[PDB]
C-alpha cells in the first residue's frame, strides 16, 4: 500500500513525450574505451584504432557497435576514454590520446587513482526550472527511482514531485527545491550504483545531508525522505510568516572565517551558515547588515551573491522549528554506515564504516540549527588521501567550492566529477560522469553503458590485441 504515479503526472508525461518526439533527433554521446598495462601500448592501440575508424569498414560501423566491442576488451591499469557523437570526433580524440595531448572530450591516465571516490551531496543554490526532466524521460532506471521517491514524498507531504519535474510552468520554492533536489540526488546515485559505481565516503552539505545519510547506509530511503520532508516543509512554512523586521538573509561572500571575525565585531547580529571554502563563507542576518558586508566586499572586487530567502537557516532563528522537527522525526531508525562519512554537521570529522549510527533525531536538529563545516570535511578528506570528489547535483555549484579547498590544501590535480548541469544534455553528462569513473579506475562496469547485442551488426571488427 503506497501511492502510484498520480493522473496529473501521467498526463504531463504524455505531453512531455510528444514535445520530445517532435524534436529534431540527435546523435548520442558514445564513450570509446582504450586501455593496456602500459601507457606506451595504450597510445599505440588508440592510433591503430583511429586508423581503422578512418578506413571504409570502420566508417561503415556505427559508433555504438564500436563502443560495444571496445567495452568487452579486458580493461587494464592504463586507461582512456574518448567521448564522441560522430566518427570524426572519435578519431580526433584518439589521435589526441595517441599523442598524449589534451582534449575536452578525452580523459586518459597512467594508472588508477589510489583511494575511492567521495560523493558530494550538496544542492543549495543548484535548483533550476527543468532540472531532472530530460533524464527522467530518457532513462528508465533514473525514472524508476524518481518514481519510488515520488511515491514516498506523497505519503509524507501529500503532493507529487514528479508533477513539479514534468511541468515547465512550475518554478521552485524553499520547500519544493529541497525535496526535488533530494529526489534527484537519490535517483542519480542509484543510477551510478546500477552501473557498478559506489562511494568510498560521503560528505553532505545542508539540504544534501539527507541523501548523503542514505548513500552512507545510515538511514533507509523511507527515513532519509522523512528527514528531507520534515525540515523542508517546516522551513517553507516558517519562512512564509516572516516579514520586514524579522526577515534574515543569506549571502555568500569572499571572506574567510577570520576576515569575518574582523567584520562580525562591527556587525554583531551576523552569523555563519556554511563554511564553504577557505575564503568563502555563507552568512545570514538582518538585511541592513548583510547588504553592508556585500557592499564592502563588492567594492573590493571580492565575490558576492545574495540568496532568495527571507529566513536564515543554520542560525538561532530556526529555534522555533526544532521541537516540531524533533516530533516529526519520531521513529526514524539510524543505522551503522556502510561507507565512510565526513560529517559537516559534526565539524567536518570522519565516521568509519561500521561505526556507531549518527543520524538520530538530534543530528537533524543540530544540522539545521548550526554551521555547516563544509570546507573542513573536504580538507579532511584530502588530508586522508582522497582525490576523487563526485557531486550528485542538478548543477555542480558545490564542486567549485571543493576546487578552492583542494587547492588550498596542496592538491592541484583532483578529479572533480560533476553530474548534471543547467543547459547541458542530461544523458550525455551522465555518460561523461561514468566515463571519468571508469578512467580513474574506480568501480564502474563499462559494459553496462551498452544495450545487450541483438545481432552481429551490434559489434565491430575493431583491431584485435591477442595472437
Amino acid at each position: 500500500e503506497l501511492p502510484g504515479v498520480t493522473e496529473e503526472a501521467l498526463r504531463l508525461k504524455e505531453a512531455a513525450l510528444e514535445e520530445l518526439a517532435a524534436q529534431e533527433v540527435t546523435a548520442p554521446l558514445v564513450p570509446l574505451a582504450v586501455s593496456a598495462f602500459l601507457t606506451s601500448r595504450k597510445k599505440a592501440a588508440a592510433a591503430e584504432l583511429a586508423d581503422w575508424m578512418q578506413s571504409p569498414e570502420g566508417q561503415a560501423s556505427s559508433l555504438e557497435s564500436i563502443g560495444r566491442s571496445l567495452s568487452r576488451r579486458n580493461h587494464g591499469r592504463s586507461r582512456a576514454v574518448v567521448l564522441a557523437h560522430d566518427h570524426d570526433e572519435a578519431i580526433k580524440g584518439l589521435r589526441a590520446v595517441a599523442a598524449g595531448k589534451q582534449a575536452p572530450n578525452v580523459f586518459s591516465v597512467d594508472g588508477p587513482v589510489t583511494t575511492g571516490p567521495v560523493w558530494v551531496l550538496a544542492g543549495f543554490g543548484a535548483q533550476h526550472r527543468k532540472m531532472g526532466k530530460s533524464l527522467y524521460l530518457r532513462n528508465e532506471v533514473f525514472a524508476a527511482w524518481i518514481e519510488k521517491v515520488d511515491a514516498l514524498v506523497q505519503d509524507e507531504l501529500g503532493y507529487s514531485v514528479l508533477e513539479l519535474i514534468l511541468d515547465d510552468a512550475q518554478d521552485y520554492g524553499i520547500e519544493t527545491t529541497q525535496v526535488t533536489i533530494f529526489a534527484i540526488q537519490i535517483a542519480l546515485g542509484e543510477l551510478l550504483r546500477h552501473h557498478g559505481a559506489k562511494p568510498a565516503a560521503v560528505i553532505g552539505q545542508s539540504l544534501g545531508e539527507a541523501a548523503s545519510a542514505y548513500f552512507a547506509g545510515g538511514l533507509s530511503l523511507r527515513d532519509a525522505t522523512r528527514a528531507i520532508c520534515s525540515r523542508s516543509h517546516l522551513m517553507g512554512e516558517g519562512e512564509a510568516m516572516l516579514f520586514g523586521e524579522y526577515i534574515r538573509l543569506m549571502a555568500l561572500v569572499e571572506y574567510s572565517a577570520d576576515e569575518i571575525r574582523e567584520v562580525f565585531s562591527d556587525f554583531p547580529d551576523l552569523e555563519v551558515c556554511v563554511y564553504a571554502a577557505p575564503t568563502q563563507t555563507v552568512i545570514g542576518g538582518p538585511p541592513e547588515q548583510v547588504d553592508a558586508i556585500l557592499a564592502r566586499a563588492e567594492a573590493e572586487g571580492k565575490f558576492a551573491r545574495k540568496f532568495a530567502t527571507k529566513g536564515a537557516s543554520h542560525t538561532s532563528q530556526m529555534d522555533p522549528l526544532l521541537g516540531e522537527l524533533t516530533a516529526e522525526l519520531q521513529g526514524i531508525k539510524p543505522t551503522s554506515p556502510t561507507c565512510g562519512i565526513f560529517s559537516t554537521v559534526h565539524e567536518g570529522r570522519y565516521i568509519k564504516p561500521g561505526g556507531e549510527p549518527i543520524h538520530d533525531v538530534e543530528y537533524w536538529k543540530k544540522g539545521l540549527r548550526h554551521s555547516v563545516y563544509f570546507t573542513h570535511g573536504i580538507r579532511n578528506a584530502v588530508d586522508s588521501g582522497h582525490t576523487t570528489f563526485l557531486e550528485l547535483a542538478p548543477n555542480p555549484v558545490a564542486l567549485m567550492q571543493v576546487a578552492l579547498t583542494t587547492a588550498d590544501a596542496g592538491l592541484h590535480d583532483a578529479q572533480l566529477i560533476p553530474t548534471l548541469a543547467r543547459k547541458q544534455d542530461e544523458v550525455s553528462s551522465m555518460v561523461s560522469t561514468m566515463a571519468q569513473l571508469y578512467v580513474y579506475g574506480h568501480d564502474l562496469d563499462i559494459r553496462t553503458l551498452f544495450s545487450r547485442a541483438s545481432g552481429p551488426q551490434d559489434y565491430a571488427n575493431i583491431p584485435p590485441t591477442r595472437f
Binding site: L83, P104, N105, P396, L399, M400, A403, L416, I417, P418, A421, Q424, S428, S429, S432, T433, A435, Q436
Partner: peptide, 10 residues
Amino acid sequence: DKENFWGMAV
C-alpha cells in the same frame, strides 16, 4: 567559473 559538455572546469 564554468563546467563544460563533459565535466571539466572550463
